[PDB]
Amino acid sequence: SKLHLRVVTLIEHPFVFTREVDDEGLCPAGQLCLDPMTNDSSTLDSLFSSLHSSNDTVPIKFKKCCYGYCIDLLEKIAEDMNFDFDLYIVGDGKYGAWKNGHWTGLVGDLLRGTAHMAVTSFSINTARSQVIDFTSPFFSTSLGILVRTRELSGIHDPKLHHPSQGFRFGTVRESSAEDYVRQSFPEMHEYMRRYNVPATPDGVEYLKNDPEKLDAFIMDKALLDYEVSIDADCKLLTVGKPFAIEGYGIGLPPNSPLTANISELISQYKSHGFMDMLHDKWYRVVPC
Amino acid sequence: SKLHLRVVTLIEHPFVFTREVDDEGLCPAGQLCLDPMTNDSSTLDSLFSSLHSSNDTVPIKFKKCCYGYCIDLLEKIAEDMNFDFDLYIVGDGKYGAWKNGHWTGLVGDLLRGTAHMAVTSFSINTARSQVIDFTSPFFSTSLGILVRTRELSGIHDPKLHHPSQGFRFGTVRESSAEDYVRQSFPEMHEYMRRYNVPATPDGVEYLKNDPEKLDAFIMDKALLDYEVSIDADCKLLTVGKPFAIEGYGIGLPPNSPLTANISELISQYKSHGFMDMLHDKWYRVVPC
Amino acid sequence: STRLKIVTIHQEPFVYVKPTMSDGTCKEEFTVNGDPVKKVICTGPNDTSPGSPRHTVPQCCYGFCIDLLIKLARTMNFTYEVHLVADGKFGTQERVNNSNKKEWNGMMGELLSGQADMIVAPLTINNERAQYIEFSKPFKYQGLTILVKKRITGINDPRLRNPSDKFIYATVKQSSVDIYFRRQVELSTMYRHMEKHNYESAAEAIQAVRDNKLHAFIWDSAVLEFEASQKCDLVTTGELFFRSGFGIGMRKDSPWKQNVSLSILKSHENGFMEDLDKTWVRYQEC
Amino acid sequence: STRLKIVTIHQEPFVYVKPTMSDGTCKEEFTVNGDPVKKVICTGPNDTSPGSPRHTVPQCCYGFCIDLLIKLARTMNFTYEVHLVADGKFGTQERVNNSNKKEWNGMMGELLSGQADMIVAPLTINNERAQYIEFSKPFKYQGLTILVKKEIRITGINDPRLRNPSDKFIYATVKQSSVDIYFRRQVELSTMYRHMEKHNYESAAEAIQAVRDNKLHAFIWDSAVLEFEASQKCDLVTTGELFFRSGFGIGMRKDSPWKQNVSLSILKSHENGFMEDLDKTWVRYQEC
């Protein structure tokens, strides 16, 4: 009767976090998460068998705490829908894109049946929608530009289109920004693939480098605003009008059932103000 | 022997001119055109029948000499297709648009089966294309702004958007330079409606008269570009960027049989040598 | 049939509510070109303050919209008795949440209930707001421009997107602009700030902007333009967005519908609407 | 199987043309890191501009296209020979004094006469050429911009300074190229084409020398070529908006037996990483 399902999640700020587990091994308002950087499903199966085994499981390196937006959102959804969940920080941490045939990251893991539940800041793309199915969005955000302080209008300006001998950009290696840039104009796709970063929570230190490496970090607006708020020195700000308005959404296996109930629950929660409550609980405003 | 046609034209420089007839009456380097200031086909028919007779009793005021770019092009089609024609001017001369259910002017006279052709500066667009038949374009146009002596950013300029500070301007009444504005930009339609002009020469004279009555202007690029480059002081100019480009054409009835050949002939002269010749012969005079 | 009870509102230049004298009649006001201005007797509350229970003696109503109402009466052969709105809010979809039910307010609620239905006022045209009442063809278009104290680029500006403490911008409470600012999930960060400040009517926003407050203000185009015209201390800025048009309202399939739209379309031509726009709008000092 | 014979044109930095030294052995160059380079023997019209066909002793060729072709020929084990175009124009359509076919010249004429097997060169793949011959999928993207002397400013194509045909701002493009055919087919402004026809240069290198001296004040060519030849010599700076994004391809005959493997090899190299290896090697920044 009790249905057990696995959950795949990255480490992306506000929406997700992490914490070193205590000696006793508990996490308040969070579940223990493993670190299996392997794509194969049989190892995941034996790892979870060890997790539920009576014999001692993998040591502390495969254990961590967690807390965040989607974590408690999924906690209440699962409490309503009468099931438990387990989480682990993927194997790649690279969202997903088309490369050498089979996809990568979350899309590759889901298409391979390693899990049945994907909760993160997952973006919305039509190309991803062709193969995988999406639910009702529970958020919406755009892309911005991060630059150290001391007038980039966005993408429609000559300062960025042609190379003015020393202007550099960069996004995540294969995020939704990469696909949109590639479908819009591939010359800039190549240009940033010259200097593209592998993950978001690295680009900020480039801006602390007295930047010769990176001078722009085009990415989603939510994490951008959070990194602006956490900037106590206030030496940075987002510039340029928003472009490519997108949305978020919980990922599901292709043609997987029980999507209607989840979408209706999300809609009802948004109507009743749970989303606003979590928004003001996690997303914090700091004057900068 | 040969086909006999009736063709209606307008009076707009430099595409078509109007030169006073000679004492004996031959219209040197031109044809003879008539304008009885009426949209009644029957009157026109009896007038034309009387004119080409053994004893014609017509007023002198009705006869004018017609010549120009468009008329020369019509003359070549007449030479190539071997048909004779009579020429007359629109009953009111206001192109054509929707008014009280029925059409008006050039389009209305085409639909009501008065003339078999409509050859003049004739901006073709969706509204007129679905009711009557149009040939291949022989020109590419634009929309520009004319401002007298003693600066705009184009069409999104805040000066012509918020009507707090008293501005001016407005296109010629009942043309395609206002149908686009009315249909695709309805908020600033009454403001242009209070400040409009019957005929383009009247508007350009209103702009060039002290005190300034109607600052600025909106009309086709070619007519404005010719009108600016005939004055001596050379103080007027063109500001902004091209927008809402349609292209010209020759008016035709509701898909008459001759709709096919004429298009390929115009394509032929456009390809070989005629458009350049004919265009350079009339766009003259030195810019100041 | 026959007798129709109509609902209006107070905002310049659509319907003034200047009180009458003690006798009951209304003094003859004069227009620019030597004509009498038509006016009607309209009953309603005496605002939130003063009065006994906001059921005051009749007032006088005359402006733009009243002329259209009189023309409709002439062309339709029917009689009216115009009364004002109980509260003054334009009317948005609201939830009491005491019974998990959706209920309207102001004009919308007083229309759906049925005690008065012609809503002759410049409401709005909206997708979901007009989803169970039938509008008519618009008689005037407008946009959502912003007025500021004597600059702002528009809705894409980092002062507007994030204030800190001294760039507060508000709008009128419980109206149409609130619906569109709430609906757009793309633009929802500012609305929370707008929940802090919101005024009951337009006059309060006027007094806030004039008296070193309310650095910005968002409202309809026509009202804002006339405001910046007559009052020579505030000027608008920012390009238009949300291009729509006003319109008369009726309940779902009321037995007039068609003739109202026919009359509106007919008067859109000829000289009626142009005359009304010339005599009741602008005539500015600059 | 068969000995495919190739045909290229002189265009830096895609291919280099250096004279044969003494006996015939190619000079041994080197890169910055000490990696040797490879060159090939080319028998073209060495003498001078396309006048007399004097001594045609082969010279040495290398660059970007040559390395790609070396990689291509190293696979599927086919030997090759290379020779330059006798005429020196990028395969456009032209008529004669007895015009009845309007055939091609340069590369397109040389390949459509059945004596060439491959065209490895940076040629734009537009619609007409794709109709008459079949290409492969692009290996590089571009968008044509313009440059000017470094003020010791223009924004795009719609800037009013460049629209009107002036006499103190003479500009043009190399004749018989992708730019000329694309501007001729597009209507926009025929006066623009007429003004271009006045001073259409003969080669893609003399125009850059002229714009560096003082002669013409705007060069309209592809993205990569202009960018490299500008940033390499610290006298020219480009400014534009990158209109007409397109690509460069490889055009064999009408479905030759070699067509099916060319695309496979080009995508294998595109995705593996060979494109980065070639691009970083032959396109770099020196001035800034």
Author numbering:
A (entry chain D), B (entry chain B): 511 to 660, 776 to 913
C (entry chain C): 395 to 544, 663 to 798
D (entry chain A): 395 to 546, 663 to 798
Passage from the reporting paper:
N-methyl-d-aspartate (NMDA) receptors (NMDARs) are ionotropic glutamate receptors (iGluRs) that mediate most of the excitatory neurotransmission in mammalian brains.
Several key differences emerged within the LBD heterotetramer layer when comparing the glycine- and CNQX-bound structures. First, we observe closure of the GluN1a and GluN3A LBD bi-lobes. This suggests that our structure represents a glycine-bound configuration, although we cannot explicitly identify density for glycine in our reconstruction. For example, GluN3A His787 forms a polar interaction with GluN1a Gly750, and GluN3A Glu812 forms an electrostatic interaction with GluN1a Arg755 (right). However, when glycine is applied to GluN1a-3A NMDAR harboring either the GluN3A His787Trp or Glu812Arg mutation, we observe no evidence of channel desensitization.
